[PDB]
Every structure is written in C-alpha cells, then in structure tokens.
Design goal:
Residues 1-131 form the Thioredoxin domain. The protein is α+β, with helices and mostly antiparallel strands. It has 8 helices and 5 strands; from the N terminus they run ββααβαααααββα. The protein has helices at 31-38, 42-49, 66-82, 85-98, 105-114, 119-126, 129-144, 171-186, and strands at 9-11, 22-26, 56-60, 152-155, 159-161. The structure holds {6-[(4-methoxyphenyl)amino]-1-benzofuran-3-yl}acetic acid (OVJ). {6-[(4-methoxyphenyl)amino]-1-benzofuran-3-yl}acetic acid (OVJ) binds next to α1.
C-alpha cells in the first residue's frame, strides 16, 4: 500500500477512546518543535488539508527542561485559557531556544506582558483552578499515549505520525507529505 503502518505512521497498541481528532504535543525546549513552528508551520499546513471546522488540539509536555518545563506547561495552560496562543508561541520559542532569555517563571510572564496580556490578567489565570485543570488535561493526554518524544501528532487516538519515515531533502515536500498523511489517517 502507499500508506503503510510503520512507514508514514504507527498504530497505537491501546487506542485512546474520546481523544481529540488531531492532537499535537510539543515542548518549547524541543528543537524540532521550533522548526515545526517557525520554518515548517506544520499546524497551519495540516489545518489547510483538513475539512473546515475540525478541531486541532496542541498541548505542552513536562518531560523536557525540568522545573522550567513544568512552568511552560502551566504557561501554555494560561495561553489556552486566555486564547493568546498565537501571541506567545513565537516569543516563547525564541526566548527559550534563540535568545535564551527565559530562565524563570518571571521571564515567561514577561513574554506575556510584552505581548499585551495585562499583569493582573496573567497572574489570576496562572493561579486559577481552571488553569490547574488545563494542566491536568495536558498531562492526562500525554499519559494516555505513553508519550516520550515530541513533536508528536495523533489522529483520532489511534494513529501516530511517523515523520522519521518522510524524506527531508526538501522542506516543502516534507510538510506536504506530513499533512497528506494526517488527511489520510483522518479519513480512515
Ligand atoms: C528542520 O526541518 C526538519 C524538521 C524535522 C525533520 N525530521 C524529523 C525526524 C524525526 C522526528 C521525530 C521523532 C523523535 O525524534 O522523537 C519527531 O519529529 C521529527 C522530525 C527534518 C527536517
């Protein structure tokens, strides 16, 4: 077959009932995740290959970066609660990996302030139980699939994208192959 289990994708040994249709996991410490955001725009290109209105979910993970890695999962919960993901994704990636100006929770908060989120607004979200639940939700989704590597994408709780089986001599071909695979999996 053109698409084969073990090539462009793998099949979860224990499917995840009730999982989101397209689920991405990333870390702001993750070098390929930086590329998936700034150079490849994987999420945008996958969205354009799926039908209008399908839900795509993107969660942060704890297992990279120690203390700050957990602070970033909580900050990503704030970003989701406030709806400001598009305002903070690039500054957080660059603060961690390019300028290395993010060394503490205060530095993370600075990124949101500079992006125009009010201080009182950020701190109330940071300390809220709604954000505690969003942190728990991100942890539970990663736990459900025994996640040990990012960037990862899962389709309908059953299939995991295998980008190591995609050719990377041409970045646009790679993005297209990745998005076409998601579309194929979503239609199974
Ligand atoms: C800069 O553009 C790019 C970006 C990425 C790649 N290849 C690549 C290879 C392996 C993985 C894994 C699995 C893992 O190691 O956990 C996740 O994502 C990957 C991406 C090639 C070119």
């Amino acid at each position: 077959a053109q698409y084969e289990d073990g090539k462009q994708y793998t099949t979860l040994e224990k499917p995840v009932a009730g999982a989101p249709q397209v689920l991405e996991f990333f870390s702001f410490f993750c070098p390929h995740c930086y590329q998936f955001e700034e150079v490849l725009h994987i999420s945008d290109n996958v969205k354009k290959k799926l039908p209008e209105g399908v839900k795509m979910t993107k969660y942060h993970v704890n297992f990279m970066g120690g203390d700050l890695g957990k602070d970033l999962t909580q900050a990503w919960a704030v970003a989701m609660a406030l709806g400001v993901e598009d305002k903070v994704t690039v500054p957080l990636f660059e603060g961690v990996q390019k300028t290395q100006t993010i060394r503490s929770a205060s530095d993370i908060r600075d990124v949101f302030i500079n992006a125009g989120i009010k201080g009182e607004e950020y701190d109330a979200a940071w300390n809220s139980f709604v954000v505690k639940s969003l942190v728990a939700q991100q942890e539970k989704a990663a736990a459900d699939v025994q996640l040990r590597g990012v960037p990862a994408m899962f389709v309908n709780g059953k299939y995991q994208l295998n980008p190591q089986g995609m050719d990377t001599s041409n970045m646009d071909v790679f993005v297209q192959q990745y998005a076409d695979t998601v579309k194929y999996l979503s239609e199974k």
